[PDB]
Design a protein around this ligand. Structure first.
Ligand SMILES: [Cl-]
Ligand SMILES: [Cl-]
Ligand SMILES: [Cl-]
Ligand SMILES: [Cl-]
Ligand SMILES: [Cl-]
Ligand SMILES: [Cl-]
Lengths: 163, 163, 163
C-alpha cells in the first residue's frame, strides 16, 4: 500500500462543471487530489493565478482530500516534488487522446516513476471546454449551465473592470 | 410545414469552389440559404467583409434563394434573429467532425431550438480549404483550380495594392 | 529505371532522433535524399537556417547519399527545381495523416508529377516532436534521449547567448 496522491494539472481558465466532475470522481478513488494550476508565464491566461485558485477552491473546497497549488516548469519536476502516484487528465475528444498518449510516453522517458491515468467525462459535460466558455462569455452569452456560479460572477467582474 | 431557412456561417476568406458546391447543394434542399460571413473583429481576416461578400455574391448570386449577410457575436443570437430552421456546415476531416459535434451540443444548450445539419464535400473539393488557398496565393501559386475566377483576380489586386 | 531523388522537407527546429531514423530508413530505399529545411520567413523558427543545417549535417553527413538545402516558397516549385521522384514525410499521429493526405492531393493538383510517400516512425521515436523538445529544453529539461548530442549542446549555447 501507501497514501495515493494524484495531480490534476490544467490552466483552469476558468474552472468548468466538467473539471468539477473529474475532481469529484478522482477524490473518491485516491487519498489526495492536487488541483495543479499551471501559472502560464509565456502562455497568457484570461484569469490570474489568484482568480483561478479562488474559483477552484470555491467549487471544490468542500472536498476534504483536495488541495490547490499553482505550478510552473516541467510537469515531471512538479510530479517528483509532490511525491505523486500519478497525473490525472480528462479525455474529451480524439485530439486530447493522441496528445495525452504522446505526453505520457515523453514524461515516462524523463521520469520512469511517472504515471498518467485518464477519465472520460459524463456526457452532460463532454462538449464543455474552458476555451469555448471564454468565447461565449466574451460575446455576452450565458455560461451559467457550464460553470459554477462563482465563475459566472467572475466573468461579470472581468467585464465591469473593462472587457 | 413552414418556409425553411438555413444559415451557412463561415469566414469565407476567401470563398472556394468547395463552399460554392455546398451552397448550391443546400439551395436545392431548403427554401432560403443565408451565406453568413463572420466579420472577425479580434479574429483578423485577409479580405474585408466587403471583399468577402462581393466574392460570394459573384459566385452564388445566380441562385435566387441565396442571401449574403455579415454577422458578429454569438451564432445562436444570429440564429434567433434570422428565424432559421438550422445551421449548415461542411465536414472535410475528422477534426472538423469533432469540433462541429462539440459546437452543435453547446449551441443546443444555449438555445434548445438550435439545429445543425452537415454536408460532406464531393471528393474533387475534399482537399480545398480557405487557409491552404491563402498559403498558395501568398507564395505566388496558381489557385485557379480551387476558387472562382473573381477570387483569383482579388488575390492579384491584393498583391498589386502591396502583398 | 532512372536515379531516384526524394525530398524530406521540414523545419527541423531542431532535428530529433525521430528525423534521423526517417532519413536513415529513406537513404536505404532511394538513390538520393535531400533534407530540405524550410527557411520560415513569416513562420519564426527558434534555430536559424545555419544552425538547423549544421545540426542536420552533424547527425546525417555520415550518409553518402544525403544532401542538405534550405528552401522557401511553394514545395511544388522546389520539387520541380530538384527534379525529385517524391516527397517523403513521417506520420506520427492521426492529425499528421489527415493534413498530409490533404497536402498530397493539393500538390498533385498544382503539379501532376508530384508524389508523396510516407514512413511510420519506430515506436521508440513515435512520441518525439521538435515542438515538444523545444518545450522541454526551454523549461530546463534533459532532451539527451530524444535528440543527437550536437542538438543538446546547441540548446546549451542558445541558453548561454540569452534564453
Ligand atoms: Cl485553456
Ligand atoms: Cl482564447
Ligand atoms: Cl479561415
Ligand atoms: Cl493565415
Ligand atoms: Cl516545428
Ligand atoms: Cl514553440
Amino acid at each position: 500500500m501507501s497514501k495515493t496522491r494524484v495531480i490534476y494539472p490544467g490552466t483552469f481558465d476558468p474552472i468548468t462543471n466538467g473539471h468539477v466532475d473529474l475532481v469529484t470522481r478522482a477524490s473518491r478513488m485516491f487519498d489526495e487530489v492536487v488541483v495543479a494550476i499551471a501559472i502560464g508565464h509565456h502562455k497568457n491566461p484570461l484569469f490570474s493565478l489568484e482568480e483561478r485558485v479562488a474559483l477552484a477552491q470555491s467549487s471544490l473546497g468542500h472536498l476534504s482530500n483536495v488541495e490547490f497549488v499553482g505550478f510552473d516548469g516541467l510537469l515531471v519536476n512538479f510530479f517528483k516534488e509532490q511525491k505523486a502516484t500519478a497525473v490525472l487528465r480528462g479525455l474529451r475528444a480524439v485530439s486530447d487522446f493522441e496528445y495525452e498518449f504522446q505526453l505520457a510516453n515523453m514524461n515516462r522517458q524523463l521520469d520512469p516513476h511517472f504515471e498518467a491515468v485518464f477519465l472520460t467525462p459524463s456526457e452532460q459535460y463532454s462538449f464543455i471546454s474552458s476555451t469555448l466558455i471564454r468565447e461565449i462569455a466574451r460575446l455576452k452569452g450565458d455560461v451559467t449551465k457550464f460553470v459554477p456560479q462563482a465563475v459566472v460572477e467572475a466573468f461579470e467582474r472581468k467585464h465591469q473592470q473593462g472587457w
